[PDB]
Amino acid sequence: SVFLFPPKPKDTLMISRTPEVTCVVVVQFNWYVDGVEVHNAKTKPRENSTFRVVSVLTVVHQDWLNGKEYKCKVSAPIEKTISKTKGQPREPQVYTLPPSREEMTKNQVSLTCLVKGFYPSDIAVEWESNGQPENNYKTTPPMLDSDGSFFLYSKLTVDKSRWQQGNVFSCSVMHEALHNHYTQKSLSLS
Amino acid sequence: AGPSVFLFPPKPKDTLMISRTPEVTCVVVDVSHEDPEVQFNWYVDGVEVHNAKTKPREEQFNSTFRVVSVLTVVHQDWLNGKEYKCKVSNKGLPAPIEKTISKTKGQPREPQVYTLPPSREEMTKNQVSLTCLVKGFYPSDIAVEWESNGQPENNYKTTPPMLDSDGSFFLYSKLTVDKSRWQQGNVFSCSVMHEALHNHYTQKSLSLS
Numbered sequence: 288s289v290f291l292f293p294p295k296p297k298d299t300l301m302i303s304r305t306p307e308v309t310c311v312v313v314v315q316f317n318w319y320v321d322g323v324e325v326h327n328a329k330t331k332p333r334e335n336s337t338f339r340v341v342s343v344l345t346v347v348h349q350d351w352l353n354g355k356e357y358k359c360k361v362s363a364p365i366e367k368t369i370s371k372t373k374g375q376p377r378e379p380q381v382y383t384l385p386p387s388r389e390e391m392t393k394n395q396v397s398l399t400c401l402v403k404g405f406y407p408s409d410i411a412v413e414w415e416s417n418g419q420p421e422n423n424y425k426t427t428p429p430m431l432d433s434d435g436s437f438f439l440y441s442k443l444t445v446d447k448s449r450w451q452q453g454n455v456f457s458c459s460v461m462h463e464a465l466h467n468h469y470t471q472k473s474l475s476l477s
Numbered sequence: 478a479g480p481s482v483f484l485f486p487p488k489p490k491d492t493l494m495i496s497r498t499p500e501v502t503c504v505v506v507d508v509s510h511e512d513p514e515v516q517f518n519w520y521v522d523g524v525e526v527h528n529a530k531t532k533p534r535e536e537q538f539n540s541t542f543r544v545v546s547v548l549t550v551v552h553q554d555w556l557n558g559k560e561y562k563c564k565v566s567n568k569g570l571p572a573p574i575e576k577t578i579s580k581t582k583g584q585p586r587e588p589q590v591y592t593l594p595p596s597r598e599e600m601t602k603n604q605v606s607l608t609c610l611v612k613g614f615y616p617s618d619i620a621v622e623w624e625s626n627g628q629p630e631n632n633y634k635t636t637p638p639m640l641d642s643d644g645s646f647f648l649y650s651k652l653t654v655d656k657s658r659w660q661q662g663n664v665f666s667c668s669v670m671h672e673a674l675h676n677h678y679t680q681k682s683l684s685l686s
């Protein structure tokens with residue numbers, strides 16, 4: 288039983304990150320990029336009541352994003368192929384939404400980042416404030432909208448005082464269809 | 478293997494509204510032509526009941542029978558965590574198949590329902606987003622609806638419940654409307670039904686101020 292995993296969307300969209308294709312078994316590994324075999328992989332030695340072998344292949348950001356195919360050959364040998372999710376790009380629209388008046392009775396409040404109209408669904412979202420990450424968020428998986436694009440929401444939970452004091456919070460979105468693969472929107476008390 | 482059994486719970490909305498009709502559904506697929514007879518026995522907290530409604534077997538395209546038994550449940554019984562058991566008997570089985578279902582367990586928490594107007598920035602578009610945030614709820618079983626002037630809205634999508642940091646769930650429901658409808662002061666209403674709400678129902682409305 289072989290399972291081939293794609294890079295995380297954020298890794299492909301940030302040059303500083305290292306996108307990887309993972310070939311998981313639950314052994315000779317042969318890796319192919321558009322048919323052409325490559326010797327780049329890092330196979331770790333075979334580590335409950337069963338065995339597991341893992342090979343990891345580092346990919347070039349642009350190659351992954353331009354749709355090159357990545358073939359893991361677990362050596363009848365099981366051969367598998369992966370590449371970027373297909374579809375014509377649609378640029379995300381990003382909107383920040385303050386907490387409801389009625390949430391102000393609570394100790395913590397909800398800062399909302401709506402991301403809609405994007406295609407395909409490979410996307411990353413982060414928050415920051417004052418030059419540091421704000422990690423107390425949950426982001427919904429992308430969901431198919433009625434027009435065939437995706438949407439999601441990210442919810443940053445923040446101490447109510449931090450919001451009342453006027454701190455500016457920022458929702459950062461990364462997607463292949465954005466200019467520079469990045470955009471940001473900010474939100475503060477108004 | 479031979480025949481297999483699937484047990485479906487009632488819809489959350491059906492359990493929460495006393496006028497509606499919550500049902501547990503027991504489905505048997507892959508019943509052979511050779512041994513086509515099926516018996517359902519139904520149990521509520523391990524006590525056999527005899528009021529289920531069983532339909533005659535139906536021939537499928539793949540030359541197998543499908544047989545369905547439906548048990549109507551008492552709303553409060555389901556909400557009070559009673560266990561519903563379907564036992565399926567068939568001569569093609571090494572032993573009868575038993576399956577049990579009940580409401581997700583765990584301390585209930587009341588959903589908080591907030592409506593959020595469109596971003597000012599979205600106002601440059603032809604269509605606008607109305608957001609209903611529902612958070613702090615347990616269990617995840619929930620129904621959410623958008624309406625205007627007592628009439629259902631045709632363009633909305635609700636995210637599946639997502640686990641929050643404290644073990645409760647949240648979701649968002651996005652309503653898309655023509656910008657003019659928002660501009661002309663129309664009232665839009667997000668209704669939520671959940672076991673931990675008073676009367677299992679709450680509605681929150683918003684309009685351009």
Ligand SMILES: *[C@@H]1O[C@H](CO[C@@H]2O[C@@H](C)[C@@H](O)[C@@H](O)[C@@H]2O)[C@@H](O[C@@H]2O[C@H](CO)[C@@H](O[C@@H]3O[C@H](CO[C@H]4O[C@H](CO)[C@@H](O)[C@H](O)[C@@H]4O[C@@H]4O[C@H](CO)[C@@H](O)[C@H](O)[C@H]4NC(C)=O)[C@@H](O)[C@H](O[C@H]4O[C@H](CO)[C@@H](O)[C@H](O)[C@@H]4O[C@@H]4O[C@H](CO)[C@@H](O)[C@H](O)[C@H]4NC(C)=O)[C@@H]3O)[C@H](O)[C@H]2NC(C)=O)[C@H](O)[C@H]1NC(C)=O
Binds near residue numbers: 481
């Ligand atoms: C012969 O044909 C019949 C009929 O085939 C049907 O028509 C033909 C023309 C084709 O198009 C088929 O694709 C089509 O299905 C076949 O019968 C099917 O058999 C399979 C099993 O092999 C059943 O699969 C199960 O499906 C349920 C969900 O079922 C709903 O959704 C279906 C499609 O979306 C729909 O067709 C069904 O009617 C049903 O709809 C629901 O019905 C209820 C009752 O009326 C209703 O109230 C609901 O509102 C309604 N739902 C919707 C969305 O409208 C799925 O949940 C099952 O998944 C479990 O089992 C899998 C293994 O079988 C497993 O991989 C999953 O992970 C999951 O496992 C369970 O997981 C939970 C934890 O979450 C755990 O608690 C359990 O222990 C665990 N394991 C279990 C339960 O074993 C499953 O996929 C089809 O329902 C069934 N179709 C019908 C109509 O009954 C038959 O297989 C064919 N035979 C051959 C040899 O080919």
